[PDB]
Amino acid sequence: GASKLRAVLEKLKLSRDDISTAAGMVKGVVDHLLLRLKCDSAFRGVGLLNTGSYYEHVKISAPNEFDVMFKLEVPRIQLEEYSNTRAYYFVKFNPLSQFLEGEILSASKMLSKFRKIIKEEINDIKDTDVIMKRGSPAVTLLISEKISVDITLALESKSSWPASTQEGLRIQNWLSAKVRKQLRLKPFYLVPKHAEETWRLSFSHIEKEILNNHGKSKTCCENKEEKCCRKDCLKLMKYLLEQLKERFKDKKHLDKFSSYHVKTAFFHVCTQNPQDSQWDRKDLGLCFDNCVTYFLQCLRTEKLENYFIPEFNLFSSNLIDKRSKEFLTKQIEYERNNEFPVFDE
Numbered sequence: 001g002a003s004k005l006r007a008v009l010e011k012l013k014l015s016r017d018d019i020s021t022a023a024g025m026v027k028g029v030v031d032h033l034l035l036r037l038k039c040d041s042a043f044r045g046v047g048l049l050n051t052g053s054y055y056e057h058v059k060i061s062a063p064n065e066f067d068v069m070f071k072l073e074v075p076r077i078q079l080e081e082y083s084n085t086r087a088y089y090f091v092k093f094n095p096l097s098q099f100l101e102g103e104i105l106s107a108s109k110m111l112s113k114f115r116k117i118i119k120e121e122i123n124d125i126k127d128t129d130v131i132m133k134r135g136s137p138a139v140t141l142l143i144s145e146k147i148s149v150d151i152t153l154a155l156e157s158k159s160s161w162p163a164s165t166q167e168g169l170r171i172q173n174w175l176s177a178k179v180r181k182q183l184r185l186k187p188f189y190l191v192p193k194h195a196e197e198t199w200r201l202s203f204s205h206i207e208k209e210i211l212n213n214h215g216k217s218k219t220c221c222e223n224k225e226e227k228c229c230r231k232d233c234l235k236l237m238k239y240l241l242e243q244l245k246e247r248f249k250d251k252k253h254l255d256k257f258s259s260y261h262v263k264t265a266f267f268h269v270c271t272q273n274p275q276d277s278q279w280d281r282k283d284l285g286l287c288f289d290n291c292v293t294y295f296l297q298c299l300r301t302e303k304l305e306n307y308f309i310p311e312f313n314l315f316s317s318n319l320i321d322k323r324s325k326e327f328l329t330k331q332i333e334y335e336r337n338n339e340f341p342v343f344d345e
């Protein structure tokens, strides 16, 4: 039961060393690219956005896959929603004036200069071997034929969040209305994920703020009396998907699913189960089942709301085809109904 889950968590700890050295390598490449991007008049204000829950500037999206975001302070920004998509927007408003097409800031034009500067730069430093693979993420780098890092350019807006987020981040009953107000005072980000000229709202930087401050109790997981299993359930959900994707690699049925889908479902379960007593460490097996059952429901109903934009369906036909969702539904059901044989030794 839960002893199989606890065995999985123990095994995962054994690759901490490989992960930290890989993240060190990513960190070096990113610092170098940050230096050259700052030379360009367009990207002078660029900087690293702190998104990682364990490492600072580096998010781990899968084994040997890392995620980095470059933020660009762009003030006096005005948004125009693209055709009721709730998540995609035209950006309107001098350093960036080169990227204008009318009153609109072109995502494709800015991404193209971003790409070109990075592609130039990875040639020079022969300290490590870095190539460019493959539109968000802007750049995927492959380091040493092993480690891949997705680099995402993000405009930073310090304005109030767009109205499409008004009913999102539904944490009031869990983390309190006070915390939700404070979080909604932080900046938001636009990335050039095209629905073209459209940008997508991004709140990835909020994850670290909640995952490591995750209890109804302010001292959840700060002492021996308050140990919950929230983080371990998220780890197990990510590992479930990673393992399924590897086993179904012959026909790549699951290519479209990612840890972002897993995380979103997991934080919806945290909303539904707001009390720390619903995440007691002794209850790991039931808590994990809660998480998997909700993910299964999202798959079967083909509905997974963006955590911040409730009318944006991560599982829409526009984003993931029906056959892929039907397929993973079937595999998750099987795993859940059979006590997760994908976790067997």
Ligand SMILES: Cc1ccc(-c2cc(C(=O)O)c3c(c2)ncn3-c2ccccc2)c(Cl)c1
Residues within 6 Å of the ligand: 191, 193, 200, 201, 202, 203, 204, 205, 206, 207, 208, 210, 260, 263, 264, 267, 307, 308
């Ligand atoms: C509590 C909490 C906090 C943050 C997130 C979060 C949000 C986004 C987003 O789209 O705003 C994320 C992400 C994680 N990882 C990736 N993206 C992302 C970013 C841009 C485009 C597509 C995808 C979640 Cl799920 C829950």
Ligand SMILES: [Zn+2]
Residues within 6 Å of the ligand: 214, 215, 220, 221, 226, 227, 228, 229, 230
């Ligand atoms: Zn806790």
